[PDB]
Design a protein around this ligand. Structure first.
Ligand SMILES: [Mg+2]
Lengths: 82, 67, 51, 455, 123, 263, 573, 98, 46, 115, 95
RNA sequence: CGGAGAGGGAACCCACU
C-alpha cells in the first residue's frame, strides 16, 4: 500500500520489538556495521537495544494485512513501546 | 549399625559410652539413671544412646568373606 | 507437536531468597555441559580466544 | 534460559530467567516465582531449556522474562505475590508496635538494592532514636505509588463510625506518594489479588522496578525475620480450658438437639419440608444442627485465640491456612462427608459393627466432636480416613479429565489470533471478532473500576 | 436454546453458563477469553461443540486437524478428496519447521538500505 | 570512638568444661567469640586414611569416617604445626601431620572390640583421649570384629578448624546466654509465668521477668564451653581469642596494603 | 458357634452367618475370605481373664500360645459376612459398664483398635492427630525411607540397595512397631527439629540441615548398585572376559582399561567413575569386538565386591557391586512420619545455626507454614513427646488410641525437666547472637531420608545421542537423553507468541534436516550432492528442483503416508 | 517353564495370550526398607481397570474396618485399587465343607 | 596372572587360570569372590 | 558432584584479593568494603565496632549469598573523616579489645587455678 | 518326573523351614526376613493378592440404563474344577 | 589406525511432581 493508506497501529508491538532486536543483534554478531557509536560495550544484544533506543536500526517491518496486502513500516518511523 | 563417635547435634563423644551404657543397663540402673551416670545432661546427647539400635551384633553373626 | 530437545537440563528445585525473581540458580555440572554458540567478532575475539 | 514446571497450564508456566551459577546441584528459583509455576519444593523437578540462537535469546528476553510476566491476561491480576514466610513477616513487620534500633535499621537498609544511601528521619527522635516498620517499607515501596487497601481483620463498622481515617486496629492500608502511611500489609495488600500494592506498582512503574520491589521486599523482610522469628508449636493449638468447656457445652447441646430431632422423626412428629421427603428433611435438620455447632465452636476458638498465636499470625497474613483450619485443630474436626452425604451404611443398616442398627446420631454417621489435639476415637479416625480418601481419589481422577479438556480447548483455538487489521481471525481468515474482546484491548493492562454515574 | 431462540441467544446463554461455573468458585476469568470461546464455538451459525465432531468438521486444513483425536481418518479422507492444506495455521507450519504466523513470524523483516548509508564499522 | 574494656571471671573450671562470664563488651563481639569457639579453633584430627585390609562388616569409608571423628589430644602441637596446604614438603611430614597405624586381627572366638586404644601414633604426645582418666571409663569404639576378621590401615592427622569439617570442632557444647532475666526483652514471652527461670537469673519466685529498661544494652555474657577432649576447655578460649585476633590483624594488613596501593 | 470355639469339627477359619430378618443362614468355608480375630463377649463380660493373661505372660515356658488361646474359646476369627451380624465394642472397660445404656448386648470386643492400621501406617506416631491424606502420604513414603533393609545386605548382591549409616529406633514409638520389627531394622534418625523460619531457605515446604551434623554422619548413607554379566551364543561368536587390547579389538571407548584385571574384571576396592570399564568382555569377530559393560555415567563410586560363578547354562557369570556413599546435600528429599516431605534447601554449619541456652543447635529446621494447612498435629505432639522421652530416659509411647496420654500430660511431664511446658524454647540467632524475639518450637522428631537423592535425578544434554528411527534426541537420564518439549509446552509458546523460539525448539534443537522435493510433483526426489545430480523420477525434469528444510519426524511422517499410498505433495509455490 | 515365565514376568496365563492375560501379579519384591518389604508382602489388588472415572470402587468402604489399612494406598492412578492388609487381618485358606 | 579367588563356602584361596569352570578344589562349591585389590586407596574422613 | 570443596569457605584463589574498596557514588563520604572468604564471624564485630564511632553516619554488613563466600561492609562517615580510616580504627580498637580480653582471661585462669 | 515347581521361601517344604536363627545366619540368611516370596532367575517375586467377586453367591443388582431393571447373578464354581466361573444372570425387564 | 563415542526395541511393573 501507498504511504497515504496506512491503517495499522503506529506503535511497535512487543513481537516486532522482540524479533527486530533479535535479528539486528544477530547482524551485529555477524560484524554488520553499527548504526550508533558505542561506548565499549561488547554484547550485540545491548548494541541492538541501544540502536533501537536511538532509532537507528536499518530495518523496516512488512505488516501483512489479512486480505493479502502489506505495509512497510520503518523502525525509525513507528513508536517504540519501551 | 554401630554407635556414632559423636552426637550429631552437640558433637560430644558418645562412641565410648555404648558399652558402659549396656553394662549399666545390666544392673538395677534404668535408662534415665544410666544416661546421667555416663554424664549425658543434654537430651541431644541422651537420645544418641537412648534411641540407638546396635545392629553390628546382628551383622557379626554372618561368617566373613575370607578366613 | 512435541519432541525431545537438545540443550535442556532437569533437576530438583529448591528455594533461595537471595536472588531476584529473574535469576535462577543452576549447578556447575549443568552449566558445564549445556552450551551456547557465540559468533566471534573483533569485540569479543580476545575473550573468546581466552575461553 | 526459559524455565518451566512440566504441567504447564498457562503462559506463566514457561518463563524466562537469568542464569546465576551456584555451587550445589539443585535449581534455585525465587520464592515469588513459585506461585506461577505452582512449585512446591517438596521434591519437584523442573526442566530448563537454553535458547541457542541469539535471535531467540533476544525474543525470550523481550517476551517471556518473569518481570514482564507479573500480571496475567487471564484475570488481569498479578501472578507472583509475597508468600510463605515473607508475607507473614511483612504482616508482623508493618504492625503499629514495631520499632527498630539504629543498628537494626542500618542492617535492614543494607539489603535494599533500590536505596539512595539516605537514612530517613526516625519516627521517634527522643528519648532515643527508633524507627518503625512502615517507615522502612516506605523506602521499600518504589517511586510514587498511591493505593488504598484493607487488612484481613478490618472491622466493618469502622468505616461507618468514627476513627475512619485514624484506624484503631491499624487496618486500611494507605500508601501515598510511594510511602506507607498506615495499615498492616497482608495477603489482600501484597498478594496476587486485583488492585493490590504490587499490581499498582507494576501498572505505574516498570516491570524491572517491580522486580526490584520483589527482591527488596524478600531480602529485607527475610533478614528482619532473623531478629523477629516465626514458628508454630503445640502451645499455639491449646485453649484456655474455659474455651474447652464452652466447646464441650456446645457439642453436648448440639448432640441433645440431634437426639431430640431423631425422637421427633421416630414418633412421626416431624413434618416433611415442602419440596423434600421425610428422609432428606431429617438429613437437612441434622446437617443444619451439626454445621451450626461446628461454626459456633470455631468462632469460640477464634475468640479465645491470643494476639501472639502463630496460627492466627499465619491465617491473618494469609500466607498459609484458613480460618477453619484453626477450628479443626483446636475445637472440632467436623462432620465427615462422602459424596456430600453423611457416612453411608456400608454394613446392614449401620456404618460400623460398633454402632447399633439404624443409628442416625452424629457419632454414628461421621461427625467428629474431637479436635486434632484431643485425637480421634477409632471410629472417628476411620471416618476421617474414609472422608479424606474421597478427596485423594478426586485429586487423581480430576487430572485425566482436566488435561484432556485443556488440550481439546487448545486444539480448537490454537490458530485464533489478532491480525494487523486489529480484528480477530482464525487460521483461514474467518472473522471471529471485529475487535479482540469486542474492544480491541489487551487483557493484561485493564483494572477493576466503578461507574460513578450508575445508580 | 439453539432450537428455540437462535444462535446469538445461544452465545449469550453459553457465556452465562460458562461464567457461572468459573465464578461459582469465586475465581475470576477475564471476559476476553469467555467471549472468544463462545464466539469461536458459535461463529459458523451452528453449535460447534469442541470435540473431534466439531473441530474437524470445519474446513481448517487436513494438516491442522490431523493433530487432534485423528491423523488416520483425516489423512486418508484428504488423500481421497485431493484436499490442499494452505499451511496458514500454526500446527501446520510447526510440523514443517517453519515460522508459525504467531507473532515474531506474523510479519517479515526488510532492510532499509537508505538507513544503511549511515553508521560505520569500528575496530 | 574507641574500644571498650571487657572483664572476665571464671565461675567453674574443669577438664571437661569452662563456665565464665564476660562483662562490658558487645553482643556482636560475644557472639563472634562463641562462633570462633566452634569454627575457628584449629585442632588435630585425621584426614587421610589408607586401608591396607578391611575384613570387617563396616566398609572402608564408614571406617574412615568413624576414625576421623575420633578426637586427638593436641594441646600445644596444634600451635607449632602447619596446614598441609602451607607446608613446603611433599605429601606428609612430621612438621604438618601425625602418622597413625592400626593393625587389629581377631583370632579367638570372642568378639574383638576395635577401640581408639588400638591406634598407635608416631608422636607420643598427639594421641586419642585415652590419655588419663584416673582422677575405669571405656574408650571410643571403632568397629567390632568376628573371629578371622581383621583390618589394617595407616592414617595421617592434619591441622584444621571446624569450618572445614565438624571433626575439627574442639568444643561439644557452647552455652551462650546474655540477659537471663528479660530486662532488654529482646525476646517476648506471651506468658512469662510459664517459662522456667534461667540458671543465672536473680529473681524471687514471685517475679517472672525483670522490669523493662529502655536504656539497657546487652552485657554480662555467660559462657559454658564444653570440650570434646582434644583441647583443654581453658585453652580452647585462648586459642579462639588468638585466632580471632590474628584474623583481624591479617584483615588490617590487607586493608593497609590496599589503601597504600590505591593512594 | 460352640463347635467352632472348641475346634471340634468346624475349624476356626469357617464363618457361620445367620441373616435374621431374611431367613437365610449361610456357612462359608472357601478360601480367600479375609478375617480378623475378635474377643468373645458373653452377657457383658469378656472371656479373656486374668488367668489367661497370666499363663500367656509366662510364655516360652508354659507354651500357652495364641493357638491355645483360640482353643480356649476366648477369641474367634470374624470375616465381613459375620461382622455384619455381630456387635462389637471398641474397649471393654469403656463400653461394657453400667451407665446410660447404649447397647448392653455386645457379642465381641476388639483386642486393640490400632490393629486396623497396616504396616507402613503402624509406624506413624499419633496418627489420629493428623489429617488422613498426611497419613496416606506417610504410608507411601515409609517404603522409600532408607535404612538397613535386611541384615544380610553384604552377602545380598542386589541392584539399587540403600542402607543408612546410623539408623535409630524412634524416641517416640507405637506399641505396634515391636511386631513390625521396626526397632530392629529402622529407617531414620531421631533428629532435633526446630519448626521456625530462620532465613527463608525452607519457605515452600523445604528444610535447613546442620552442616556440622552431616559432617558428623547425620543421615549419611551408602548406595549399592550391582552389575551383572554372563559370557556365552553362536557357533563361533564366543563371549569371553579379558582385558581388551587396542591392536586386537576394533571398537573401544576412550575409557581407560588398565583398571581391569587380565581376567576382564576389576578387583574390589578400586575407585571408579563414570565411563570407566568394569567388565571387559569381547566377542570374536568373523579381529574382535568388545561388549564391555561401562559404569553408569555420573555414578562415581567404589567397587565393593566381585563374584564369579556359573549360571544354569554352565557359562561364566559375574556380578559386581559398587559402593557409593551419599552425603546429605541440598535437594535431597527428607520426610517425617506425618507426610511432611521436603528437600534440603541449605546446610548451615553449627556456628550459623540457631542454638538454645545450651549449645543445642537443631539438626533440622522446617517451615512453620507447613503445619496449619496440612494439620499434622501429630507432628507437633511427636516433637513434644520426643523431648519428654529424651529427657526422662523412657521411650515415648504414641499408640493411636491410647487415651492414657494427651497433650496436657505430656506438657506437665516436660515442665518437670526445666523446659517450657509447650516445647517452645528461646533460641539465639546464629549470626548476630541476638535472641530471637519469638520463641522457637524445638524437639527430637524422627525424620527419614528418602531414596530420591538429587544426584540421581540431575542431568543435562547438549547434542548427545540420537534415536535410530527418527533422528530426535534419546529419552532417559541414563541414555544421556533430552527433555520432552511436549504438546502443552508448544501451546504455552504459542500463547507467548514466540514463533521463532517454537521453531528453534522443535526444529534445530531436536532434528534439523534437509530434503529435496520436485517443483512439479511435491514428492521427495533423489539428490546426489557430490556430483550435484538432482533428478526426480516420475517427471524426468532434473532441472527445477527445490531444497526444503524439514524436521526428520516430518519427513518420516511423509514417508509413512506415502507407504500408506497417501501422496503428500509439497509445492513451494 | 510356564510357572517360571508366569511368576517372572507377571502375565498370569499362557505365554501365547500375553496381552489377554492380566498383568501386575508377581511383582519384583521391593527391598529398599524392611517396612517396604512387609508392605509389599501384605498387599491386595483390585483387578478393575485403572484410569477410570468411576470412583465408587476406589472409595474406602465401611467393611474395610480392621482388615484393610485405611491410610495406606498409592497416591497415583491406583488410589483405593491397590490396598495393603491390616495387621491382625488373616485370609482364610479353605477346607472341605464335608 | 594368578588372580587368586575366594570360595564362598570354605573361604579357601584357590588358584584359577583363565577359561576354567568356576570350581573349588575342595567342597565343590561354585560361587567365588575375587579379592581385595592391591592398589592404594585414599579416603578423606569427611 | 557439584559439592564445593570444604576449604572453599576461607581460602583465596590465586589472584583474588582479601579486601576490595569501592567508593559509593550515591552519598558522600561513603564506601563499600568487599571482603572475600569471610562471613558473619568478622562482619558482625566489624559492624558493631564501627557503630560505636560517633563520626560514622552509616555502618552495616551483608552476605550477598550464603553459598558464595563474600561480605559487603558499607561505611558512611562525617566529612573530615574517612570511611577507610574509620574501618582501620575500628579494626585496631577491636584488636586491642581482643588482646586485653586475652590478658584478662589468662589472668582469671591463673587465679582460678588454686587461688 | 513332571517338572520343577517354584517354591516359596520359609514355606513348609522350603529348605529354611523351622531353622533356628543361628542356622539361618550360617546359611547367610536373614533371621528377620519374613519370607513368603519366590526366587526365580535370582530375583525375588511376590504374588500380589488379587480381589474378585465371591463365587456361588446370589447378587441382585439394578443397572441404571438397560432394557431390564433388576438382574440377579451368581457366578458359580465347583471345588476348584477346570471349568471357569460359569456366571448365570436372572433378570427382570424394565417395562 | 583417522580421538572410533549413536549404546536395539517392545512389553509390563513400581515410583516421583
Ligand atoms: Mg510439589
Amino acid at each position: 500500500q501507498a504511504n497515504q493508506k496506512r491503517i495499522t497501529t503506529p506503535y511497535m508491538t512487543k513481537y516486532e520489538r522482540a524479533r527486530v532486536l533479535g535479528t539486528r543483534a544477530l547482524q551485529i554478531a555477524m560484524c554488520a556495521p553499527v548504526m550508533v557509536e558505542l561506548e565499549g560495550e561488547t554484547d550485540p544484544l545491548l548494541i541492538a537495544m541501544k540502536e533501537l533506543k536511538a532509532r537507528k536500526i536499518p530495518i523496516i517491518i512488512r505488516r501483512y494485512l489479512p486480505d493479502g496486502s502489506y505495509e512497510d513500516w520503518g523502525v525509525d518511523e513507528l513508536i517504540i513501546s519501551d | 549399625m554401630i554407635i556414632p563417635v559423636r552426637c550429631f547435634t552437640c558433637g560430644k563423644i558418645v562412641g565410648n559410652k555404648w558399652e558402659a551404657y549396656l553394662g549399666l543397663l545390666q544392673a538395677e540402673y534404668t535408662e534415665g539413671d544410666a544416661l546421667d551416670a555416663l554424664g549425658l545432661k543434654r537430651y541431644c546427647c541422651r537420645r544418641m544412646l537412648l534411641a540407638h539400635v546396635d545392629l553390628i551384633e546382628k551383622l557379626l553373626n554372618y561368617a566373613p568373606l575370607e578366613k | 507437536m512435541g519432541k525431545r530437545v537438545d540443550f535442556s537440563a532437569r533437576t530438583v528445585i529448591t528455594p533461595d531468597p537471595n536472588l531476584s525473581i529473574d535469576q535462577v540458580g543452576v549447578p556447575r555440572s549443568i552449566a558445564a555441559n549445556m552450551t551456547f554458540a557465540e559468533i566471534v567478532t573483533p569485540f569479543n575475539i580476545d575473550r573468546l580466544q581466552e575461553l | 534460559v526459559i524455565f518451566n514446571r512440566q504441567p504447564t497450564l498457562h503462559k506463566m508456566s514457561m518463563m524466562g530467567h537469568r542464569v546465576r551459577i551456584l555451587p550445589w546441584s539443585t535449581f534455585r528459583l525465587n520464592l515469588s516465582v513459585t506461585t506461577p509455576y505452582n512449585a512446591d519444593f517438596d521434591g519437584d523437578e523442573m526442566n530448563l531449556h537454553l535458547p541457542q540462537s541469539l535471535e531467540t535469546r533476544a525474543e525470550i528476553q523481550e517476551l517471556a522474562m518473569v518481570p514482564r510476566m507479573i500480571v496475567t491476561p487471564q484475570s488481569n491480576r498479578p501472578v507472583m505475590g509475597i508468600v510463605q514466610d515473607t508475607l507473614t513477616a511483612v504482616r508482623k513487620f508493618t504492625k503499629r508496635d514495631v520499632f527498630l534500633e539504629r543498628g537494626e535499621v542500618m542492617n535492614l537498609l543494607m539489603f535494599l538494592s533500590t536505596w539512595d544511601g539516605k537514612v530517613p528521619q526516625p519516627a521517634i527522635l527522643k528519648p532515643r532514636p527508633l524507627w518503625t516498620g512502615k517507615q522502612i517499607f516506605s523506602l521499600i515501596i518504589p517511586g510514587h505509588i498511591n493505593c488504598i487497601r484493607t487488612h484481613s481483620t478490618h472491622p466493618d463498622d469502622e468505616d461507618s463510625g468514627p476513627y475512619k481515617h485514624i484506624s484503631p486496629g491499624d487496618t486500611k492500608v494507605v500508601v501515598e506518594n510511594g510511602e506507607l502511611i498506615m495499615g498492616i500489609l497482608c495477603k489482600k495488600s501484597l498478594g496476587t489479588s486485583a488492585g493490590s500494592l504490587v499490581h499498582i506498582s507494576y501498572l505505574e512503574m516498570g516491570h524491572d522496578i517491580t522486580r526490584l520491589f520483589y527482591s527488596n521486599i524478600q531480602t529485607v523482610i527475610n533478614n528482619w525475620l532473623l531478629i523477629e522469628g516465626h514458628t508454630i508449636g503445640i502451645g499455639d493449638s491449646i485453649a484456655d480450658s474455659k474455651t474447652y468447656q464452652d466447646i464441650q457445652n456446645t457439642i453436648k447441646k448440639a448432640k441433645q438437639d440431634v437426639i431430640e430431632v431423631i425422637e421427633k422423626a421416630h414418633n412421626n412428629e416431624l413434618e416433611p419440608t415442602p419440596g423434600n421427603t421425610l428422609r432428606q428433611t431429617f438429613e437437612n435438620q441434622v446437617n443444619r444442627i451439626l454445621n451450626d455447632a461446628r461454626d459456633k465452636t470455631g468462632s469460640s476458638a477464634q475468640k479465645s485465640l491470643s494476639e501472639y498465636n502463630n496460627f492466627k499470625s499465619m491465617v491473618v497474613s494469609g500466607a498459609k491456612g484458613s480460618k477453619i483450619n484453626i477450628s479443626q485443630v483446636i475445637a472440632v474436626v467436623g462432620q465427615q462427608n462422602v459424596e456430600g452425604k453423611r457416612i453411608p451404611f456400608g454394613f446392614k443398616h449401620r456404618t460400623l459393627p460398633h454402632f447399633i442398627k439404624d443409628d442416625y446420631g452424629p457419632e454414628s454417621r461421621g461427625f467428629v466432636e474431637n479436635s486434632y489435639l484431643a485425637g480421634l476415637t477409632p471410629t472417628e479416625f476411620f471416618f476421617h480416613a474414609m472422608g479424606g480418601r474421597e478427596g485423594l481419589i478426586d485429586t487423581a481422577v480430576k487430572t485425566a479429565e482436566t488435561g484432556y479438556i485443556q488440550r481439546r480447548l487448545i486444539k480448537s483455538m490454537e490458530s485464533v489470533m489478532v491480525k494487523y487489521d486489529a480484528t480477530v481471525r482464525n487460521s483461514i481468515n474467518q472473522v471471529v471478532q471485529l475487535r479482540y474482546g469486542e474492544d480491541g484491548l489487551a487483557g493484561e493492562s485493564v483494572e477493576f473500576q466503578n461507574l460513578a454515574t450508575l445508580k | 436454546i439453539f432450537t428455540v431462540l437462535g444462535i446469538e441467544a445461544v452465545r449469550k446463554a453459553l457465556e452465562r453458563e460458562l461464567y457461572h461455573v468459573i465464578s461459582f468458585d469465586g475465581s475470576y476469568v477475564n471476559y476476553r477469553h469467555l467471549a472468544l470461546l463462545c464466539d469461536t464455538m458459535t461463529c459458523r451459525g451452528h453449535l460447534m461443540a469442541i470435540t473431534r465432531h466439531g473441530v474437524n468438521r470445519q474446513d481448517t486444513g487436513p494438516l491442522m486437524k490431523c493433530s487432534f483425536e485423528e491423523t488416520v481418518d483425516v489423512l486418508m479422507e484428504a488423500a481421497a478428496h485431493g484436499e490442499s492444506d494452505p499451511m496458514k495455521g500454526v500446527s501446520e507450519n510447526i510440523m514443517l519447521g517453519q515460522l508459525a504466523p504467531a507473532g515474531t513470524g506474523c510479519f517479515d523483516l526488510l532492510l532499509d538500505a537508505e538507513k544503511c548509508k549511515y553508521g560505520m564499522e569500528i575496530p | 570512638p574507641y574500644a571498650n574494656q571487657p572483664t572476665v571471671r571464671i565461675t567453674e573450671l574443669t577438664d571437661e568444661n569452662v563456665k565464665f562470664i564476660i562483662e562490658n563488651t558487645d553482643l556482636a563481639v560475644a557472639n563472634s567469640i562463641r562462633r570462633v569457639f566452634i569454627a575457628e579453633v584449629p585442632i588435630i584430627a585425621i584426614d587421610w586414611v589408607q586401608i591396607d585390609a578391611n575384613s570387617s562388616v563396616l566398609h572402608d569409608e564408614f571406617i574412615a569416617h568413624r576414625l576421623g571423628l575420633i578426637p586427638l589430644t593436641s594441646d600445644d602441637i596444634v600451635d607449632k604445626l602447619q596446614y598441609s596446604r602451607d607446608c613446603t614438603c611433599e605429601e606428609f611430614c612430621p612438621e604438618c601431620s601425625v602418622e597413625f597405624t592400626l593393625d587389629v586381627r581377631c583370632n579367638e572366638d570372642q568378639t574383638r572390640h576395635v577401640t581408639s586404644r588400638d591406634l598407635i601414633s608416631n608422636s607420643p604426645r598427639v594421641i586419642p583421649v585415652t590419655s588419663r582418666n584416673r582422677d575405669e571409663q571405656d574408650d571410643i569404639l571403632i568397629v567390632k570384629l568376628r573371629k578371622g576378621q581383621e583390618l589394617r590401615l595407616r592414617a595421617y592427622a592434619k591441622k584444621g578448624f571446624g569450618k572445614e569439617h565438624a571433626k575439627w570442632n574442639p568444643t561439644a557444647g557452647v552455652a551462650f546466654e546474655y540477659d537471663p532475666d528479660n530486662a532488654l526483652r529482646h525476646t517476648v514471652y506471651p506468658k512469662p509465668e510459664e517459662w522456667p527461670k534461667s540458671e543465672y537469673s536473680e529473681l524471687d519466685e514471685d517475679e517472672s521477668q525483670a522490669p523493662y529498661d529502655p536504656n539497657g544494652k546487652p552485657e554480662r555474657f555467660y559462657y559454658n564451653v564444653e570440650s570434646c577432649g582434644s583441647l583443654r576447655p581453658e585453652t580452647i578460649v585462648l586459642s579462639a581469642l588468638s585466632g580471632l585476633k590474628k584474623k583481624l590483624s591479617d584483615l588490617q594488613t590487607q586493608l593497609s596494603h590496599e589503601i597504600q596501593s590505591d593512594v | 458357634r460352640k463347635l467352632r470355639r472348641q475346634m471340634d469339627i468346624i475349624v476356626s477359619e469357617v464363618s457361620m452367618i445367620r441373616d435374621i430378618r431374611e431367613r437365610e443362614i449361610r456357612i462359608y468355608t472357601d478360601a480367600g475370605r479375609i478375617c480378623r480375630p475378635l474377643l468373645i463377649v458373653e452377657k457383658q463380660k469378656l472371656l479373656l481373664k486374668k488367668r489367661h493373661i497370666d499363663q500367656l505372660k509366662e510364655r516360652e515356658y508354659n507354651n500357652y500360645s495364641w493357638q491355645d488361646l483360640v482353643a480356649s474359646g476366648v477369641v474367634e476369627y470374624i470375616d465381613t459376612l459375620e461382622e455384619e451380624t455381630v456387635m462389637l465394642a471398641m474397649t471393654p472397660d469403656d463400653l461394657q459398664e453400667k451407665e446410660v445404656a447404649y447397647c448392653s448386648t455386645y457379642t465381641h470386643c476388639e483386642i486393640h483398635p490400632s490393629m486396623i492400621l497396616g504396616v507402613c501406617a503402624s509406624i506413624i506416631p499419633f496418627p489420629d492427630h493428623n489429617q488422613s491424606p498426611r497419613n496416606t502420604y506417610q504410608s507411601a513414603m515409609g517404603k522409600q525411607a532408607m535404612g538397613v533393609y535386611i541384615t544380610n545386605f553384604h552377602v545380598r548382591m542386589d541392584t539399587l540397595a540403600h542402607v543408612l549409616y546410623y539408623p535409630q529406633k524412634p524416641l517416640v514409638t507405637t506399641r505396634s512397631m515391636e511386631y513390625l520389627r521396626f526397632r530392629e531394622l529402622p529407617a531414620g534418625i531421631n533428629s532435633i527439629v526446630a519448626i521456625a523460619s530462620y532465613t527463608g531457605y525452607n519457605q515452600e515446604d523445604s528444610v535447613i540441615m546442620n552442616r556440622s551434623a552431616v559432617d558428623r554422619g547425620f543421615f549419611r548413607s551408602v548406595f549399592y548398585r550391582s552389575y551383572k554379566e554372563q559370557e556365552s551364543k553362536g557357533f563361533d561368536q564366543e563371549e569371553v572376559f579379558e582385558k581388551p587390547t587396542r591392536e586386537t579389538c576394533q571398537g573401544m571407548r576412550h575409557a581407560i582399561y588398565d583398571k581391569l584385571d587380565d581376567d576382564g574384571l576389576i578387583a574390589p576396592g578400586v575407585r571408579v567413575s563414570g565411563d570407566d570399564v568394569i567388565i571387559g568382555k569381547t566377542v570374536t569377530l568373523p579381529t574382535k569386538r568388545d561388549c564391555s559393560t561401562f559404569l553408569r555415567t555420573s555414578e562415581t563410586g567404589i567397587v565393593d565386591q566381585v563374584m564369579v560363578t556359573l549360571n544354569q547354562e554352565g557359562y561364566k557369570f559375574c556380578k559386581i557391586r559398587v559402593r557409593s556413599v551419599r552425603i546429605p546435600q541440598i535437594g535431597d528429599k527428607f520426610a517425617s512420619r506425618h507426610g511432611q516431605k521436603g528437600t534440603c534447601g541449605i546446610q548451615y554449619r553449627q556456628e550459623d545455626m540457631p542454638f538454645t541456652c545450651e549449645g543445642i543447635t537443631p539438626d533440622i529446621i522446617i517451615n512453620p507454614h507447613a503445619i496449619p494447612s496440612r494439620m499434622t498435629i501429630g507432628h507437633l505432639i511427636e516433637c513434644l513427646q520426643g523431648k519428654v522421652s529424651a529427657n526422662k530416659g523412657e521411650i515415648g509411647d504414641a499408640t493411636p488410641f491410647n487415651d492414657a496420654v494427651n497433650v496436657q500430660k505430656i506438657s506437665n511431664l516436660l515442665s518437670d525437666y526445666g523446659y517450657h511446658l509447650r516445647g517452645n524454647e528461646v533460641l539465639y540467632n546464629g549470626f548476630t547472637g541476638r535472641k530471637i524475639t519469638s520463641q522457637i518450637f524445638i524437639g527430637p522428631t524422627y525424620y527419614q531420608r528418602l531414596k530420591h537423592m538429587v544426584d540421581d535425578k540431575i542431568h543435562s544434554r547438549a547434542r548427545g545421542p540420537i534415536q535410530i528411527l527418527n533422528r530426535q534426541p534419546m529419552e532417559g537420564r541414563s541414555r544421556d537423553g533430552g527433555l520432552r518439549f511436549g504438546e502443552m509446552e508448544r501451546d504455552c509458546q504459542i500463547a507467548h507468541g514466540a514463533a521463532q523460539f517454537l521453531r528453534e525448539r522443535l526444529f534445530e534443537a531436536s532434528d534439523p534436516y534437509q530434503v529435496h522435493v520436485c517443483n512439479l510433483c511435491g514428492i521427495m526426489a533423489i539428490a546426489n550432492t557430490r556430483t550435484h545430480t538432482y533428478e526426480c523420477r516420475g517427471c524426468r525434469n532434473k532441472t527445477q528442483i527445490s531444497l526444503v528444510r524439514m524436521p526428520y519426524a516430518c519427513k518420516l511422517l511423509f514417508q509413512e503416508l506415502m507407504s500408506m499410498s497417501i501422496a503428500p505433495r509439497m509445492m513451494s509455490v | 517353564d510356564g510357572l517360571k515365565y508366569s511368576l517372572a514376568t507377571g502375565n498370569w496365563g499362557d505365554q501365547k495370550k500375553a496381552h489377554q492375560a492380566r498383568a501386575g501379579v508377581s511383582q519384583v519384591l521391593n527391598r529398599l526398607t524392611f517396612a517396604s518389604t512387609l508392605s509389599h508382602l501384605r498387599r491386595l489388588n483390585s483387578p478393575i481397570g485403572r484410569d477410570g472415572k468411576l470412583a465408587k470402587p476406589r472409595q474406602l468402604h465401611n467393611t474395610l474396618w480392621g482388615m484393610v489399612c485405611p491410610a495406606e494406598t498409592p497416591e497415583g492412578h491406583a488410589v483405593g485399587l491397590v490396598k495393603n492388609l491390616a495387621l491382625m487381618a488373616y485370609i482364610s485358606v479353605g477346607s472341605q465343607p464335608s | 596372572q594368578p588372580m587368586i579367588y575366594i570360595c564362598g563356602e570354605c573361604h579357601t584361596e584357590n588358584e584359577i587360570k583363565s577359561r576354567d569352570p568356576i570350581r573349588c578344589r575342595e567342597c565343590g562349591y561354585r560361587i567365588m569372590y575375587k579379592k581385595r585389590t592391591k592398589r592404594l586407596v585414599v579416603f578423606d574422613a569427611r | 558432584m557439584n559439592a564445593p570443596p570444604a576449604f572453599e569457605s576461607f581460602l583465596l584463589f590465586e589472584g583474588e584479593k582479601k579486601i576490595t574498596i569501592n567508593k559509593d557514588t550515591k552519598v558522600p563520604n561513603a564506601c563499600l568494603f568487599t571482603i572475600n572468604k569471610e562471613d558473619h564471624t568478622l562482619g558482625n564485630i566489624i559492624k558493631s565496632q564501627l557503630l560505636k564511632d560517633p563520626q560514622v553516619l552509616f555502618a552495616g554488613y551483608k552476605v550477598p549469598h550464603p553459598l558464595e563466600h563474600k561480605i559487603i561492609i558499607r561505611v558512611q562517615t562525617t566529612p573530615d573523616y574517612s570511611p577507610q580510616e574509620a574501618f582501620t580504627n575500628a579494626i585496631t580498637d577491636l584488636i586491642s579489645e581482643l588482646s586485653l580480653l586475652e590478658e584478662r582471661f589468662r589472668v582469671a585462669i591463673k587465679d582460678k587455678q588454686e587461688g | 518326573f513332571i517338572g520343577k515347581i517354584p517354591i516359596m521361601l520359609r514355606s513348609t517344604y522350603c529348605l529354611l523351614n523351622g531353622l533356628t536363627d543361628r542356622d539361618l545366619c550360617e546359611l547367610n540368611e536373614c533371621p528377620l526376613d519374613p519370607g513368603g516370596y519366590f526366587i526365580i532367575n535370582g530375583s525375588e517375586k511376590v504374588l500380589i493378592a488379587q480381589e474378585k467377586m465371591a463365587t456361588n453367591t446370589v447378587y441382585v443388582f439394578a443397572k441404571k440404563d438397560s432394557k431390564y431393571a433388576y438382574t440377579g447373578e451368581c457366578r458359580s464354581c465347583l471345588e476348584n474344577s477346570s471349568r471357569p466361573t460359569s456366571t448365570i444372570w436372572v433378570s427382570m425387564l424394565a417395562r
